[PDB]
Amino acid sequence: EAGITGTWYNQLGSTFIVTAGADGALTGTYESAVGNAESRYVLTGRYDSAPATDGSGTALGWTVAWKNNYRNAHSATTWSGQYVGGAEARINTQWLLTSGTTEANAWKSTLVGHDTFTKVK
Amino acid sequence: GITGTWYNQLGSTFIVTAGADGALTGTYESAVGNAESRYVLTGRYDSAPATDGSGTALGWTVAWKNNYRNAHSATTWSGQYVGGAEARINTQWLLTSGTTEANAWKSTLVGHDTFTKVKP
Amino acid sequence: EAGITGTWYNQLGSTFIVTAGADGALTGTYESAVGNAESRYVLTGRYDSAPATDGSGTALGWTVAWKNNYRNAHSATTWSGQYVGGAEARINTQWLLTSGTTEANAWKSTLVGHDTFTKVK
Amino acid sequence: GITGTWYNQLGSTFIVTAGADGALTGTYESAVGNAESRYVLTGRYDSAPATDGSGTALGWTVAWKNNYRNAHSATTWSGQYVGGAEARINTQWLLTSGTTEANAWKSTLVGHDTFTKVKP
Numbered sequence: 001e002a003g004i005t006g007t008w009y010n011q012l013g014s015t016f017i018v019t020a021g022a023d024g025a026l027t028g029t030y031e032s033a034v035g036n037a038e039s040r041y042v043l044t045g046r047y048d049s050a051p052a053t054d055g056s057g058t059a060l061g062w063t064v065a066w067k068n069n070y071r072n073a074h075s076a077t078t079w080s081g082q083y084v085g086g087a088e089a090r091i092n093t094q095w096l097l098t099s100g101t102t103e104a105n106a107w108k109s110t111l112v113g114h115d116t117f118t119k120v121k
Numbered sequence: 122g123i124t125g126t127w128y129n130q131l132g133s134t135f136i137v138t139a140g141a142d143g144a145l146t147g148t149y150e151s152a153v154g155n156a157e158s159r160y161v162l163t164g165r166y167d168s169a170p171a172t173d174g175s176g177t178a179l180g181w182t183v184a185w186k187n188n189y190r191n192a193h194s195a196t197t198w199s200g201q202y203v204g205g206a207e208a209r210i211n212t213q214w215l216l217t218s219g220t221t222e223a224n225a226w227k228s229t230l231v232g233h234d235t236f237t238k239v240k241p
Numbered sequence: 242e243a244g245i246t247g248t249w250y251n252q253l254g255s256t257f258i259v260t261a262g263a264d265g266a267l268t269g270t271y272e273s274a275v276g277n278a279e280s281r282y283v284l285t286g287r288y289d290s291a292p293a294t295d296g297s298g299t300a301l302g303w304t305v306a307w308k309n310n311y312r313n314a315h316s317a318t319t320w321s322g323q324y325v326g327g328a329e330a331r332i333n334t335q336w337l338l339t340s341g342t343t344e345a346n347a348w349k350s351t352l353v354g355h356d357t358f359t360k361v362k
Numbered sequence: 363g364i365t366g367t368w369y370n371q372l373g374s375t376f377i378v379t380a381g382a383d384g385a386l387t388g389t390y391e392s393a394v395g396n397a398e399s400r401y402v403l404t405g406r407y408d409s410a411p412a413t414d415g416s417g418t419a420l421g422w423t424v425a426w427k428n429n430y431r432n433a434h435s436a437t438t439w440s441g442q443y444v445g446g447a448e449a450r451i452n453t454q455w456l457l458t459s460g461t462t463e464a465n466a467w468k469s470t471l472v473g474h475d476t477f478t479k480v481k482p
């Protein structure tokens with residue numbers, strides 16, 4: 001919880017501002033340093049609020065639809081990963097970014113990637 | 122529209138409400154895996170989609186913990202809603218399990234689900 | 242082995258002509274019905290030449306680099322999946338399509354998708 | 363450029379010859395999982411890449427059967443070679459295991475490896 005709540009950045013310089021509720025909610029804003037995007041976008045997601053005790057990381061995920069007041073890229077990214085607490089805390093994720101497409105173009109609708117988030121404060 | 126009760130090819134049940142400002146909320150019930158009864162989901166969708174006939178982009182997350190079970194895992198679906206006579210939500214998903222560092226290389230499954238308003 | 246070798250088609254109408262060697266090699270050509278592609282492209286791959294007997298599918302994979310005499314899309318696709326035998330023979334796959342990019346565009350280098358192949362028939 | 367011995371962040375060993383007309387041939391040794399010693403690999407790469415500073419697209423496959431073990435699985439790596447002072451091969455990979463029809467939804471692992479001339 002307090003481990004996850006805070007501000008994180010990935011290797012691209014994007015900014016991930018998240019609040020982890022005691023229920024398992026993730027709420028916050030995302031600012032991508034790249035792509036058809038500017039300023040902050042609403043995010044929401046979920047996380048395992050009772051993780052395993054064997055030293056495993058905490059599973060989690062969240063979504064951003066790339067519409068705000070400034071731009072709309074008609075697409076959405078989901079990040080799926082785990083929080084790994086400790087000396088060098090991090091959120092290791094893989095993501096899927098789907099753009100709305102016509103049916104003829106559906107085969108190329110989805111980008112796949114990976115972001116590593118590390119935390120300040 | 123998006124709000125409704127959807128089923129995928131596995132027989133899983135996706136009950137979702139689309140807010141006017143882009144929020145998705147509801148419950149997910151998986152017919153397979155370490156899962157039982159309903160799980161909370163949240164997500165986002167493009168509340169002002171293109172008019173060129175493109176689908177509506179969206180995504181949502183389920184953390185696989187409820188009062189019945191906890192698989193220490195989370196799935197995210199990324200895809201698009203495609204309107205028409207037979208509405209469909211086409212998705213690909215990433216399912217990540219909490220692992221020790223030794224096992225992180227095998228933390229994540231990938232797959233694809235297609236959702237329809239047709240019951241198993 | 243005698244199952245995999247053949248001409249397959251996927252849901253896009255692409256043509257996968259493959260030969261499975263006794264040793265585990267896959268060789269042949271791929272013709273995509275969509276994208277920056279025309280005519281046949283060389284593929285190479287591997288498959289499990291001693292599969293389990295519990296009813297599990299046969300694991301396999303292959304690569305096409307999208308360069309031939311006709312075009313060069315500066316891209317490569319890998320299909321990873323399994324062959325499921327029978328009269329209802331199919332190869333179920335997911336794929337990763339990576340394009341060569343500059344460092345600035347690396348985050349968006351890779352598409353992900355899924356193809357299902359069946360025969361003719 | 364590509365021809366040589368590479369290592370990823372797991373300590374796995376990627377020995378590859380890149381042919382002039384686009385073949386990749388070599389052996390792979392994974393430092394993790396149900397595997398031991400070297401496995402045959404084969405793949406393809408763009409033998410006439412763009413000159414705009416873009417990387418060189420490539421891919422290869424390993425079937426996890428050798429003389430020592432058989433994991434009834436196959437991994438494909440998809441990525442690009444980036445030449446230069448910090449030369450590397452950046453990939454994402456898909457690992458499918460043979461499954462029964464009922465377990466097909468969980469047949470495929472997804473991940474990412476970065477290969478350098480350095481080992482960890």
Ligand SMILES: CC(C)COC(=O)CCCC[C@@H]1SC[C@@H]2NC(=O)N[C@@H]21
Nearest residue numbers: 012014032035036037066073075077
């Ligand atoms: C490529 C294009 C057609 C898709 O639309 C966007 O640019 C929306 C912005 C996506 C930013 C991605 S989301 C995943 C990746 N991580 C980040 O921090 N930023 C990137």
Ligand SMILES: CC(C)COC(=O)CCCC[C@@H]1SC[C@@H]2NC(=O)N[C@@H]21
Nearest residue numbers: 133151153154155156185192194196
């Ligand atoms: C390691 C893994 C096997 C453990 O996690 C779970 O079984 C939780 C349940 C996951 C169900 C998946 S979510 C993606 C796929 N779609 C569905 O409707 N059901 C499946």
Ligand SMILES: CC(C)COC(=O)CCCC[C@@H]1SC[C@@H]2NC(=O)N[C@@H]21
Nearest residue numbers: 255273275276277278307314316318
């Ligand atoms: C950025 C991208 C659009 C450029 O690369 C190509 O179009 C090369 C051709 C890709 C064809 C893909 S390979 C995966 C999918 N399955 C098929 O049979 N055909 C499609």
Ligand SMILES: CC(C)COC(=O)CCCC[C@@H]1SC[C@@H]2NC(=O)N[C@@H]21
Nearest residue numbers: 374392395396397426433435437459
């Ligand atoms: C059920 C499955 C986990 C069994 O398959 C294997 O362990 C075969 C070995 C796979 C090693 C993977 S291939 C992708 C990843 N990168 C590496 O260098 N090593 C890992």
